[PDB]
Design a protein around this ligand. Structure first.
Ligand SMILES: Nc1ncnc2c1ncn2[C@@H]1O[C@H](COP(=O)(O)OP(=O)(O)OP(=O)(O)OP(=O)(O)OP(=O)(O)OC[C@H]2O[C@@H](n3cnc4c(N)ncnc43)[C@H](O)[C@@H]2O)[C@@H](O)[C@H]1O
Length: 187
């Protein structure tokens, strides 16, 4: 059971991941988490991200692709995993295809741009990430619309070809209601 969660930053993807991990017994592969951990621990693979992330830019495809390939080769990903924050560009999705990483579900969280900003502010006040500042968040959203949002069509086409199942949920609904709409899809 392999699942990709698509959407804009702050769309609620990490919030919903916990429910999905618990129900299907799979770990979450969050490139954002793996990179912040790399920085903290000084790991050779990923410490380089620190400055890119605080700038609200994307990290290079080559670095994030490697981190992910290493994470998913571990035995606890044998029976599936939940990708949260990867693929974030077309080249990253192409690498998965070329490496034979098929996925069973692609789930798109639709949330308007104006809602993201306020959602990330309200959570940036306690998690103290520099990329949750207001102006950085508006840079991340522009990058999102240019580099990441085309994945919606990329994977809508994959599902048409029978390679995955594609669904959209309305992420403006409250947390419990989003959860239940995702269960209608996955169950
Ligand atoms: N693959 C990659 N390639 C290249 N670079 C990469 C990369 N991956 C990472 N990077 C780099 O690393 C940086 C960080 O990326 P990344 O770690 O991915 O940060 P992010 O996931 O984009 O930001 P969030 O974690 O806040 O988004 P979310 O969808 O999880 O929303 P959330 O659930 O938290 O919820 C948000 C807020 O809303 C709340 N909320 C959640 N759901 C709802 C709801 N239904 N209704 C109301 N409020 C809700 C939440 O409580 C919360 O406060 C990137 O900018 C890049 O530099």
């Amino acid at each position: 059971m392999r699942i990709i969660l698509l959407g804009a930053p702050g769309a609620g993807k990490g919030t919903q991941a916990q429910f999905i991990m618990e129900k299907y017994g799979i770990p979450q592969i969050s490139t954002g988490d793996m990179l912040r951990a790399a920085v903290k621990s000084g790991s050779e693979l990923g410490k380089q991200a620190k400055d890119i992330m605080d700038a609200g830019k994307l990290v290079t495809d080559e670095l994030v692709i490697a981190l992910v390939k290493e994470r998913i080769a571990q035995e606890d990903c044998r029976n599936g995993f939940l990708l949260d924050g990867f693929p974030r560009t077309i080249p990253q999705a192409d690498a998965m295809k070329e490496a034979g990483i098929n996925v069973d579900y692609v789930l798109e969280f639709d949330v308007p741009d104006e809602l993201i900003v306020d959602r990330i502010l309200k959570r940036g006040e306690t998690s103290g990430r520099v990329d949750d500042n207001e102006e950085t968040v508006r840079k991340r959203l522009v990058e999102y619309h240019q580099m990441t949002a085309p994945l919606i069509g990329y994977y809508s086409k994959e599902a048409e070809a029978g390679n995955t199942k594609y669904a959209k949920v309305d992420g403006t609904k409250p947390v419990a209601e989003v959860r239940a709409d995702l269960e209608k899809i996955l169950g």
